[PDB]
Amino acid sequence: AIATYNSHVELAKYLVSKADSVYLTIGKSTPWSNETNPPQPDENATVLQEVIGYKKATKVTLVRPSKSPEDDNKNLISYGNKSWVEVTPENAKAEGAKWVYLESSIVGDELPLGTYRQVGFVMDLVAKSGISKFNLVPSEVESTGTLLFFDNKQFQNRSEQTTAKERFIVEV
Amino acid sequence: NFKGSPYLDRFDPSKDRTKVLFNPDRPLQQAELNEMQSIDQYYLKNLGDAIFKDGDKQSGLGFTLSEDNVLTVNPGYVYINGKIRYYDNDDSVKITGVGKETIGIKLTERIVTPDEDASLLDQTSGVPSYFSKGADRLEEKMSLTVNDPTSATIYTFMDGDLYIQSTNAEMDKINKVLA
Amino acid sequence: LLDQTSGVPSYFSKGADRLEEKMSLTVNDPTSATIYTFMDGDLYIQSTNAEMDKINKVLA
Amino acid sequence: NFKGSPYLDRFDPSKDRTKVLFNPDRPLQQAELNEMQSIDQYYLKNLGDAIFKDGDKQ
Amino acid sequence: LLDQTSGVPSYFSKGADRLEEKMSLTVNDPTSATIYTFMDGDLYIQSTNAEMDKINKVLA
Amino acid sequence: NFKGSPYLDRFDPSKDRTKVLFNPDRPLQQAELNEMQSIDQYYLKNLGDAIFKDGDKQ
Amino acid sequence: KDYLGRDDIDVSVYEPFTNIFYTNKSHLNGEDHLMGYYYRFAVINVSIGDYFPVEIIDVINEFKPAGVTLYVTYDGASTIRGGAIIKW
């Protein structure tokens, strides 16, 4: 047996259906052993090191690379030095849009201010009772969930003036 | 109070302003929308008040009393605070069964936001504003109260006995003219 | 009536207008809504409670 | 005269049109907003005329 | 219904629909709101002035 | 039924929601406008039903 | 570009007042937002496609015109090592 194009679209739509629980998270506020060259990630990891906070995912949607003229006059995304066009869940299969686009923005000091070197997109996150706000710190979280796609970086720095926009595209 | 920062409702009855006249090619103001609905609701409240009283029962609301003086009211219509509201709450408030006791309904204002209720997020398929936050909602639920002077009386009891009956709809101003 | 968020005059400050309806009192204008009637400076008809023309017509 | 040039309110009782049904991704005409409130005020006027007369003291 | 405001970007552009509710006459339709009743071509009940069911119950 | 896709009228009497409170720096939804007039029309219907009956000649 | 190292980085300035919701022209469910504090004139949001010191904000303070509020956005995508698309 083999995996079909429509099976990948079905997996993309499954990720769409799970989009409500998705949360952006960052961590690793301390230095690496090699700041000028961060280390490779470990796939077996269960949670980011030195978690700073969690933020709800602003946007999860299916996309595809754009092509003229049928995408010229429509909403568009730039990512990976390539143009992308949004496609709805109920039109993905006919468009063959088996790409998924993820985004979330950490605006200002809505989470604790400091350096950070790790980024990841968890799902199935649950906060404590009565914590309805999107932005969360690790003490307020009830269920951290799964450590879906994450990556390391060189250290950044943040302030009330700064917004950190983090996003991904994934082939599923 | 909706005159504050988050909403900036500019409605005020003393100004005698009864219509927001929008103009073309201008930046739209959320204050104007808030006032637009406020005016209509205020005049509807006025028209209601001219006829009904806050404790007037229209239909239904047949009460049930258990042996332990626990009181439950069936669904029904009622005029409270400028509107005729359909009561449909399953309260179970009990009375002391001694002395004069009055059953009243209290209206509590609460704010519902997209953060609490995710359905309020925009769900127009295939637009830029998809899943974006938007306007909040004012939720006004009704609950039973006993011996509360702030609440609108619906029933009165004397030693656990019903004091006054009212078979059909109550209309205070009409009843005054008829009397 | 200017934009309260900005709170200053500006190109974006203006917006919708308002319809104001001020009541005034008259003497013998037929177009105005009559509330009282007088005969030689004496009151003509009283009404102790709310007036309702259609209701009263039914009741009569 | 709210049918005039600045507002262009399209309300008229003969048409028997009771609701403005907005649609996504279209211009929000100011005339539609004006008519949106005008309909409600007209029907409130009808409801008040079915009970009361002009100059009825309360 | 097209925008007819002179000299705007949205000139002649589509917009909000309308909800047209046209009243028609019917005979022996149960869904309709009855207004008259006849027996062998003869009027069954008269009403000289406005009808008000709730008010009529209290008055009765 | 206006709850469907082309209008998405989000009014429902069982929710006891009586005002659409707009906020600044947000996008404007057609569903909010539809609900804005729907609430007023439903409460006007409730007021009229408390007094009159369908088919009541005036 | 003259405080960071090079020219090939993506840098643009966003002006939110262009997306103010006007009654007529703006689409109802479009990209425009209702006028307020952020969607306001004399405001700018600068997107930068690379790592930067916070002191770069002070550099913009040296350059921007007086009376304009400044925001900075950090686009993590542009910094990603190699191709940023992840495979399953």
Judge contact between G21 and G28, C-beta under 8 A: no
Query: CA distances (Å), D23 to each of A155, B94, F28, G28, G30, in order?
Result: 47, 50, 12, 8, 12
Phi and psi based region of residue G76 (left: phi greater than 0; alpha: psi -120 to 50; beta: remaining) = alpha
| Contact flag B168-E5 (C-beta cutoff 8 Å) | no
**Contacts with F21 from chain B: Cβ below 8 Å:** 2, 7, 34, 111, 135-138
Among the listed residues C59, C57, C60, C56, the one whose alpha carbon sits nearest the alpha carbon of residue C47: C56
Q: How far apart are CA G5 and CA B68, in angstroms?
A: 82
- Chain C contact probe: residue of B3, B8, B20, B51 with most C CBs at under 10 A: B20
Experimental method: cryo-EM
The secondary structure of chain D in percent helix, strand, coil, rounded to multiples of 5, reads 40, 10, 50
**Contact criterion met (CB below 8 Å) for E3 and G24:** yes
Q: How far is CA A73 from CA A67, A84, A169, E11, in A?
A: 11, 13, 22, 21
Residue in A153, A164, A135 with CA at minimum distance from that of residue A53: A135
Q: Is the minimum CB–CB distance between E7 and chain G shorter than 8 Å?
A: no
* DSSP letter string, B38-71: HHHHHHHHHHHHTT--TT-EEEE--EEE-TT-EE
Query: By three-state DSSP, how is residue C20 classified?
Result: strand
Query: For strand B136-146 and strand A141-143, is the pairing parallel, antiparallel, or unpaired?
Result: unpaired
Cβ count near D15 (within 10 Å)? 11
For the packed helices F30-51 and B30-49, what is the interaxial angle rounded to 10 degrees? 10
The torsion region of residue B25 among left (phi > 0), alpha (psi -120 to 50) and beta comes to: left
| Tokens, residue A90 | 């109920």
What token pair was written down for F4?
């469907």
- State both tokens at D19: 């609701």
Q: Resolution of this PDB entry, in A?
A: 4.0
Q: Name the closest residue on chain C to residue B35, using Cα atoms.
A: C18
D25–G29 CB contact, under 8 Å: yes
Q: Which helix (H) or strand (E) holds F50?
A: helix F30-51
Burial of residue G57, with CB atoms counted within 10 A of its CB: 0-12 exposed, 13-18 middle, 19 or more buried: middle
Helix boundaries (H) for chain G: 55-63, 76-79
F22 in contact with B at a CB cutoff of 8 Å?
Answer: yes
The pair of three-digit structure tokens given for residue E51, joined into one six-digit string:
């009808």
With touching defined as 3 or more inter-chain CB pairs under 8 Å, the answer for chains B and C is: yes
CA distance C45 to C34: 12
Interatomic CA distance for residues A146 and A152, integer angstroms: 17
**Contact predicate E54/F54, CB 8 Å:** no
Q: What distance in Å separates the CA atoms of residue E19 and residue D21, rounded to the nearest whole number? A: 7
Cβ A120 vs Cβ A147: under 8 Å: yes
* Residue C21 DSSP SS3: coil
Answer for the pair F38, F12: CB distance below 8 angstroms, yes or no. Answer: no
CA B111 to CA B4: how far, in whole Å?
14
Chains that touch C (3 or more CB pairs under 8 A): B, D, E, G
- C-alpha count within 13 angstroms, C-beta hemisphere, residue B149: 0
Q: Is C14 on the interface with D (CB under 8 A)?
A: no
Does residue F28 sit at the G interface (CB-CB below 8 Å)?
yes
Rounded Cα distance, A41 and A152, in Å: 7
> Rg of chain F's alpha carbons, rounded to an integer?
14
Size of interface B-D (CB pairs under 8 A): 39
Rounded Cα distance between A78 and A86, Å, is 11
How many helical (H) and strand (E) elements, i.e. helices and strands, does chain G have?
2, 4
Tokens representing B26 are: 């201008």
Helix (H, G, I), strand (E, B) or coil at G86: strand
SS (H, E, C) chain A: CCCCHHHHHHHHHHHHHHHHHCEEEEECCCCCCCCCCCCCCCCCCCCCCCEEEEEECCEEEEEEECCCCCCCCCCEEEECCEEEEEECHHHHHHHCCCEEEEEEEEEHHHCCCCCEEEEEEEECCEECCCCCCCCECHHHEEECCECCCEEEEEEECCCCCEEEEEEEEEEC
Measured CA to CA, the distance from residue G27 to residue A167 in angstroms comes to 27
Which chains, if any, share at least 3 CB pairs under 8 A with chain F?
Answer: B, D, E, G
Q: Which of A60, A103, A99 is nearest to A83 (CA)?
A: A99
Q: Measured in whole angstroms, how far is the alpha carbon of residue B5 from the centre of its chain?
A: 24
3-state secondary structure of E53: helix
Cα dist. A72→A68, E10, G12 in Å?
A: 6, 22, 21
From residue C37, alpha-carbon distances to A18, C24, C40, C51 in Å are 74, 17, 10, 15
The one-letter amino acid at G88: W
Give D29's contacts in chain E (Cβ within 8 Å): 3, 5, 10, 15-16
Residue B94 neighbours by CB under 8 Å, 6+ apart: B68, B69, B70, B71, B146
- Whether the CA torsion C30, C32, C38, C40 is positive or negative: it is negative
Q: Across the interface, do D32 and E15 touch by the CB < 8 Å criterion?
A: yes
CB–CB of G88 and A119 under 8 A? no
Using a 10 angstrom Cβ sphere, with 0-12 exposed, 13-18 middle and 19 or more buried, the burial of residue B50 is middle
Considering only alpha carbons, which residue of chain E is nearest residue F51?
A: E54
CB of F21 less than 8 A from some CB of G:
no
Give the C-alpha separation, C35 to C42, whole Å.
Answer: 14
Is residue F20 classed as helix, strand or coil in its secondary structure? strand
Q: What is the largest CA-CA distance in chain A?
A: 53
**What's the Rg (C-alpha) of chain B?**
21
